[PDB]
Amino acid sequence: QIAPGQTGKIADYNYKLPDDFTGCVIAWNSNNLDNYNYLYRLFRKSNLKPFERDISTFPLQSYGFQPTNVGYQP
Amino acid sequence: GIYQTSNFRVQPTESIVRFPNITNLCPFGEVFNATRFASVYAWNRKRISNCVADYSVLYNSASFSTFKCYGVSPTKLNDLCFTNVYADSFVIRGDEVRQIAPGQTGKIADYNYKLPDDFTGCVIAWNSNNLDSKVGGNYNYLYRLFRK
Amino acid sequence: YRVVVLSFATVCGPKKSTNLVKNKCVNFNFNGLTGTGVLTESNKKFLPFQQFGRDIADTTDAVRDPQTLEILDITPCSFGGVSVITPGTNTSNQVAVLYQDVNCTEVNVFQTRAGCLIGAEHVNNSYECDIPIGAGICASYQTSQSIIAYTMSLGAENSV
Amino acid sequence: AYTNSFTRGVYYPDKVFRSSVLHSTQDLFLPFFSNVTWFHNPVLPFNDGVYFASTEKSNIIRGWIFGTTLDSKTQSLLIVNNATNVVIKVCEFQFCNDPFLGVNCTFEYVSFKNLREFVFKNIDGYFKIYSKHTPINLVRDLPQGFSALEPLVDLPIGINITRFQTLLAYYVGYLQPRTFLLKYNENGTITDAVDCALDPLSETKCTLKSFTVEK
Amino acid sequence: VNQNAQALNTLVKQLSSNFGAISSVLNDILSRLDPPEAEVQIDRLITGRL
Ligand SMILES: *[C@@H]1O[C@H](CO)[C@@H](O)[C@H](O)[C@H]1NC(C)=O
Ligand SMILES: *[C@@H]1O[C@H](CO)[C@@H](O)[C@H](O)[C@H]1NC(C)=O
Ligand SMILES: *[C@@H]1O[C@H](CO)[C@@H](O)[C@H](O)[C@H]1NC(C)=O
Ligand SMILES: *[C@@H]1O[C@H](CO)[C@@H](O)[C@H](O)[C@H]1NC(C)=O
Ligand SMILES: *[C@@H]1O[C@H](CO)[C@@H](O)[C@H](O)[C@H]1NC(C)=O
Ligand SMILES: *[C@@H]1O[C@H](CO)[C@@H](O)[C@H](O)[C@H]1NC(C)=O
Ligand SMILES: *[C@@H]1O[C@H](CO)[C@@H](O)[C@H](O)[C@H]1NC(C)=O
Numbered sequence: 188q189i190a191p192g193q194t195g196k197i198a199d200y201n202y203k204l205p206d207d208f209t210g211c212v213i214a215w216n217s218n219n220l221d222n223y224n225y226l227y228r229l230f231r232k233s234n235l236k237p238f239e240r241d242i243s244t245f246p247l248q249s250y251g252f253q254p255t256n257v258g259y260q261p
Numbered sequence: 262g263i264y265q266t267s268n269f270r271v272q273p274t275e276s277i278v279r280f281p282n283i284t285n286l287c288p289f290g291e292v293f294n295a296t297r298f299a300s301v302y303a304w305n306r307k308r309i310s311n312c313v314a315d316y317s318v319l320y321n322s323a324s325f326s327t328f329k330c331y332g333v334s335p336t337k338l339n340d341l342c343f344t345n346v347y348a349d350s351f352v353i354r355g356d357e358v359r360q361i362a363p364g365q366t367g368k369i370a371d372y373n374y375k376l377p378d379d380f381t382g383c384v385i386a387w388n389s390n391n392l393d394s395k396v397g398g399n400y401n402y403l404y405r406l407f408r409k
Numbered sequence: 410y411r412v413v414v415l416s417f418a419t420v421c422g423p424k425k426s427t428n429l430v431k432n433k434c435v436n437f438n439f440n441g442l443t444g445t446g447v448l449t450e451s452n453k454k455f456l457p458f459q460q461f462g463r464d465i466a467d468t469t470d471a472v473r474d475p476q477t478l479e480i481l482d483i484t485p486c487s488f489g490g491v492s493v494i495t496p497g498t499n500t501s502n503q504v505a506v507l508y509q510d511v512n513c514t515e516v517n518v519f520q521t522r523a524g525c526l527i528g529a530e531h532v533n534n535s536y537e538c539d540i541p542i543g544a545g546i547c548a549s550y551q552t553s554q555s556i557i558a559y560t561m562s563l564g565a566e567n568s569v
Numbered sequence: 570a571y572t573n574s575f576t577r578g579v580y581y582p583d584k585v586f587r588s589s590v591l592h593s594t595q596d597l598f599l600p601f602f603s604n605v606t607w608f609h610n611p612v613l614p615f616n617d618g619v620y621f622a623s624t625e626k627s628n629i630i631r632g633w634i635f636g637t638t639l640d641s642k643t644q645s646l647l648i649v650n651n652a653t654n655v656v657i658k659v660c661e662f663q664f665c666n667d668p669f670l671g672v673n674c675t676f677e678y679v680s681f682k683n684l685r686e687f688v689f690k691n692i693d694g695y696f697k698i699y700s701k702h703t704p705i706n707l708v709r710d711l712p713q714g715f716s717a718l719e720p721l722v723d724l725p726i727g728i729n730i731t732r733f734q735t736l737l738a739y740y741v742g743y744l745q746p747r748t749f750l751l752k753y754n755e756n757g758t759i760t761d762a763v764d765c766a767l768d769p770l771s772e773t774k775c776t777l778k779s780f781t782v783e784k
Numbered sequence: 785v786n787q788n789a790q791a792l793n794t795l796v797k798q799l800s801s802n803f804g805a806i807s808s809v810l811n812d813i814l815s816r817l818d819p820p821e822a823e824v825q826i827d828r829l830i831t832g833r834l
Contacts, residue, residue: 192820206820263494263540263548270488270507271515273445280424280440281475287420298411310675326410326419333417342421345675349414351493358410374414381417389411417789419725443811455586455757458720462586462757473584 189214200228205237218260223249225261287312291317292348293385298393300349301373302405309346316341316383321342325387331363332381341373349374352393358386372408429474434486439472444483451482487515489524494540496550505529505548505556519558521546529558536562570607572710574599574742579619579749579762580688580699580718587753593765594751596745597690597744601664601771603780605711605742610669612639612734618690618744619733622711625683631670635655636640636734644675644728646696649736655680669737676726680777681738688718690744691730698722711740717759750775803832 191208200203204212222231232252252261287309299305316338319328327393333341353361353369360367362377376384434447442461453471455462462471462480466498472481488510496503505528508516513525520526523543538561547561577597597618605620615635623630628650636645640663648660651670661673661734688699699718748765765775775783791831806817807830813825 206823246805249821263492263507263542265490265492267491268488269511269516270493271434272487273434273486275430275433276427276436276438277430277448278425278427278438279429279475280426283423283426292413308675309420312421313423314420316422318454338448339422344419347416349411349416349465353410353412355410358412359412361412362488376414380416382414382416384412385410386412391410453757454588456581457720458581458584459586459757460584462588465590466793467800468796517690 195226196229199234199237200231203235203237203239208237216252216257216260218256221261222252222256225250225252283313285311285313287314289315289348292350294318295325298389300402301351301353301369302403304349304351304374307348307350309348314338314343314346319383319385325385326381327358328385329362329377330383332379333383335383338383352389352399353386361386368404368406372405419435426476429477431481437483440475442469442472444469445486447484447486449482449484451480453480453482455480469554487511494526494529494542494548494556496556500550501554503528503554503556505558507542521558526558529556532559533559570609571604572607572740573762574601574603574620574711575711575713576601576603576739576762577686577711578688578742578744579715579751579759581720581759582751584720586749586757586758587751589755590753591606592751592753593748593775593778595746595748598747598749598764599688600745600747600777601767603742605740607710607743608735608739609737610667610737612732615689615730615733616743617746619688620689620744621689621735621739622741623685623687624681624705624711625685625706626681629737630685630735630739632736633733634664635669635730637729637731638723639732639734644726646726646728646730659726662684668734670688676724684712686716687716688744689733691726691728694725694727694728696722696724696726697722698724714775715761726728748775749763750778750780752780765769798833801832803828805829805832 189204189212191204192206193204198238205212215229226247226249228241228247235241250261251259292307316335317324320335320338328335351374357367357369359365360369361376361384363376363380365376370376374391393402418517429448431448431450434445437444437446437448440460450531451471453462455471455473460473460475461469462473470483472483473479474481489511490507492507492509494505494507505526507524507526509524511525513520516525516527517530518525518527519529519531521542521544523546526542526546526548529548534545536551536559537548541547542558545560546558548556548558551557580598582594582596582598599620605622621633631651632647633648634645634647635741637643638644641661643661645664646661647656647660647662649656655678657676657678657689658674659676682704684701684703684705686703688697688700690697697720699720701716701718701731705712750763750765752761754760761780763771763774763780765771774780800808805825806813808829809830810826812826813822813829816822
């Protein structure tokens with residue numbers, strides 16, 4: 188979902204990259220370091236705009252992160 | 262001189278959408294509003310095909326104690342359309358209504374019906390004390406409790 | 410508790426229609442087509458199975474309403490060129506504007522066969538060509554100075 | 570036996586009004602002047618699509634069956650008229666080995682002096698029926714002429730069909746993807762057609778998009 | 785009068801042509817494909833029409 192013009196719960200409602208993104212996306216598993224502090228959004232009235240953020244909160248859930256956890260790793 | 266610069270164009274005043282008369286309803290009344298509902302060891306099933314499916318009425322109706330969609334969000338149902346659809350219907354204890362979800366476990370989820378973890382559909386339940394319940398007990402209803 | 414499962418082409422949700430309106434530009438849809446246009450009554454006779462009707466070059470120009478068994482002319486929502494008539498800027502900043510083909514309403518106004526002209530005075534005398542417009546009309550900047558529009562003169566006439 | 574398609578087996582190929590106009594199209598159409606088989610109830614191939622015509626006196630011809638194996642292994646189209654009503658179904662039927670009339674299910678429906686012309690094709694999951702009814706006065710052949718079959722029925726079957734049979738003269742030809750030029754009157758009805766591969770004059774009329782051409 | 789009607793009819797007819805795109809109808813690229821894909825299809829209709 189972390190790529191220009193993607194779709195899915197994050198790319199619609201939580202972290203959106205423009206059609207005209209210009210940058211690099213760099214990522215790694217943190218299972219060996221990271222824990223229900225990490226939330227994400229499931230619901231919204233409409234998509235957020237590219238590089239928007241928000242602080243209203245029911246629309247959110249926690250990720251199932253534990254050091255036991257590949258797609259379910261942090 | 263005379264020059265040409267840009268173009269005049271009247272813009273549309275309002276949005277008009279048109280479809281046929283809203284006939285050929287799905288007969289959800291035979292599934293939600295009937296006089297009789299099934300014994301869980303041998304639950305009823307009905308085809309849904311060739312029809313306008315009024316999911317909107319079900320979603321906005323107050324008669325349900327629980328309603329959920331198990332692979333879709335319940336607001337979309339009024340625009341969605343499907344290849345084939347089936348209703349299932351049955352009657353349960355409140356502590357065993359707690360087995361109606363994708364991939365859940367228990368005597369009903371082992372031996373009296375099954376939904377995939379990848380199940381697609383809308384699933385609903387309501388109180389029936391005023392309708393099903395009898396002062397002696399509903400012994401017409403059964404669970405296939407012990408099944409290998 | 411009573412329970413129902415609805416497990417999931419022939420099973421579609423209830424499509425909502427709007428109330429119909431005529432002789433205005435609208436953002437229309439009928440069943441499976443969409444556009445911007447004017448919906449209007451017509452004398453056309455489509456066969457009962459026909460739902461759209463066509464121009465010579467692929468373009469829809471009529472439809473049959475899916476509730477109302479009468480045929481609509483669809484007319485494109487009106488448009489035209491905006492041409493600006495000006496003396497040279499080393500004279501004046503006044504201008505007159507030609508809305509092409511549209512007949513003076515949809516837009517000190519003068520309907521012509523070239524379109525609606527706005528901001529030029531219709532004068533009964535004819536004069537030579539200074540700025541051309543079309544369909545015999547010209548315009549010029551003349552004296553209290555203004556843009557004037559009139560039928561042009563082909564010459565002084567002479568019975569020989 | 571075999572007979573001539575002449576200029577029959579043209580139909581309205583889309584739900585669109587056209588008038589005073591000469592429109593070019595490509596669809597499964599009956600090739601002009603091709604041989605059609607003639608019958609006075611065999612199983613037949615369906616191929617890409619069927620043109621079927623039945624000639625009448627006394628309501629002899631009741632309908633058809635369409636599918637592949639036609640004996641309960643898979644779904645199969647039934648189309649019938651019995652006494653005063655049409656019946657249409659698609660079930661996994663245990664049909665007879667040779668069906669005739671005396672004197673799992675997913676879709677069901679219930680409602681020579683004559684010629685009744687039909688075209689059948691199954692495309693993109695949809696069964697299409699086109700047909701025409703007329704009075705006639707002929708015994709030995711289809712009457713040489715032209716008419717267009719309007720669509721009547723449009724069923725989202727999704728059931729593969731490769732063979733068919735008749736239920737009780739009749740004639741059968743097969744549709745092909747040939748280009749047709751189609752002439753519509755002011756009333757919006759198709760009054761003539763050109764099969765654009767029949768002869769070099771038809772190649773000309775369809776290149777020039779005209780039913781009539783200068784020297 | 786024929787050529788100056790025929791080049792117009794030819795130029796109108798080139799509105800129906802696909803030019804290698806998913807479809808020639810402009811609302812039905814947009815109301816089907818997301819903007820990152822819809823622009824790669826509409827760049828075809830623009831190169832064709834132009
Ligand atoms: C069932 O009938 C009741 C009548 O009170 C109605 O409110 C409800 O919407 C109906 N639902 C369906 C699916 O028919
Ligand atoms: C357009 O011009 C005609 C005369 O040709 C006139 O009858 C009609 O009312 C005019 N349109 C408007 C909007 O005034
Ligand atoms: C032109 O002259 C006629 C009389 O011959 C008069 O009716 C009309 O109003 C005049 N028009 C203008 C633009 O002066
Ligand atoms: C089949 O068609 C050809 C012309 O293409 C004709 O010569 C031939 O006799 C026909 N055959 C039969 C048996 O009708
Ligand atoms: C219907 O299809 C199922 C498989 O989906 C098969 O087990 C069953 O025997 C079929 N029924 C009939 C009447 O053939
Ligand atoms: C029709 O045949 C195709 C194979 O060409 C197959 O994939 C499809 O499932 C078949 N349809 C039905 C309804 O059996
Ligand atoms: C069109 O139909 C009308 C009857 O509504 C008839 O009078 C007219 O002659 C027909 N036109 C043609 C070209 O057949």
